[PDB]
Amino acid sequence: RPWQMKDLQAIKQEVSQAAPGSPQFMQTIRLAVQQFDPTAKDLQDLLQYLCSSLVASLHHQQLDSLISEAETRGITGYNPLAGPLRVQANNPQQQGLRREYQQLWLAAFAALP
Amino acid sequence: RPWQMKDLQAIKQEVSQAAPGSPQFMQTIRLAVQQFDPTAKDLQDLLQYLCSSLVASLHHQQLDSLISEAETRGITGYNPLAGPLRVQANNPQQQGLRREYQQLWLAAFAALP
């Protein structure tokens, strides 16, 4: 049940006043992600939609840091013999990787300031 | 699953204030193009709805130049013996041409200001 235009347009409508990292922004983003269970593709689409390119680049720097840290430490179901988490979260039969990526996404967005 | 009247109305209303090629307009138009997966015909309809004949003509010229360079170089899926890229992009079995058309379209429209 990937989001259509209407869902994302709403999300941006109520994430317009607040700034990234503020309680409202993170509240809405976490709700949307926990509801639709989106993969990395839809997450990157949502980020490109919401904020400027500078904020997206900052978020991706933080996300690369978090993902590198986690892969060094070890992920429950991460098998690097097929592709990065980045690509392992697109396969629908890898729910654990997808949820881990969503959580790193939300953390990296919350730690921008 | 082509867009409907409500989607177009929302797309136009959300970006009424902004100017063509502004980061906001680029965000919303790029999201629409990447989400609905339309051909050239639907893109022409969308442009006619959004901007006037002047902006339509300027985008038409810019896209003509961009398509010119792109398919004069030679593209993986383009075979010039069957028809112009505007017609190949309208055949649902040539998704590579469709995606190239979408990207040339968005870049051309972004190159206005």
The structure's method of determination equals cryo-EM
* A4 at interface of B, judged by CB pairs closer than 8 A: yes
Give the closest-approach CA distance of A102 to chain B in angstroms: 20
Give the closest-approach CA distance of B6 to chain A in angstroms: 9
d(CA B5, CA A33): 27
d(CA A29, CA A64): 19
Selecting from B10, B23, B30 the residue whose C-beta is nearest the C-beta of A5 gives B10
C-alpha dist (Å) from residue A96 to A50, A76, A100, A103, B43: 26, 8, 6, 11, 38
CB burial of A93-109 (b: ≥16 within 10 Å; e: otherwise) equals ebeebbebbbebbbebb
d(CA B16, CA B38): 22
- Interface probe with A: pick from B5, B15, B31, B42, most Cβ of A within 10 Å: B31
Q: How far is CA A43 from the centre of its chain?
A: 5
DSSP state of A20: T
CATH 3.40.960.10 fits A5-111, yes or no: no
C-alpha dist (Å) from residue A13 to A32, B13, B28: 13, 12, 12
DSSP chain B: ----HHHHHHHHHHTSSSPTT-HHHHHHHHHHHHHH---HHHHHHHHHHHS-HHHHHHHHHHHHHHHHHHHHH--SS--TTS--HHHHTTSTT-HHHHHHHHHHHHHHHHT--
**How many other C-beta atoms are found inside a 10 Å radius of the C-beta of residue A89?**
24
Token pair of A60 as six digits: 């991706």
* B12 at interface of A, judged by CB pairs closer than 8 A: no
Q: Is A56 helix (H, G, I), strand (E, B) or coil?
A: helix
Q: Do the Cβ atoms of A48 and B32 come within 8 Å?
A: no
- The residue whose two tokens read 């409508």 is A13
* Contact between B108 and B17 (Cβ < 8 Å): no
CB burial of B103-113 (b: ≥16 within 10 Å; e: otherwise) equals ebbbebbbeee
- The residue whose two tokens read 């986690």 is A70
Cβ burial, residue B45 (10 Å; 0-12/13-18/19+): middle
User: Cβ contacts (< 8 Å) between A52 and chain B: which residues?
Assistant: 23
User: Cβ contacts (< 8 Å) between B32 and chain A: which residues?
Assistant: 5
H-type helices in chain A, by residue range?
A: 5-14, 23-36, 40-50, 53-73, 85-88, 95-110
Q: How far is CA A56 from the centre of its chain?
A: 11
Q: Residue A57 corresponds to which amino acid?
A: S
In angstroms and rounded to an integer, the radius of gyration of the C-alpha atoms of chain B is 14
Q: Do the Cβ atoms of A5 and B35 come within 8 Å?
A: yes
C-alpha dist (Å) from residue B66 to A29, A101, B82: 37, 37, 20
Resolution in A: 6.9
* Contact between B107 and B30 (Cβ < 8 Å): no
Residues 81-110 of A with CB under 8 A from B: none
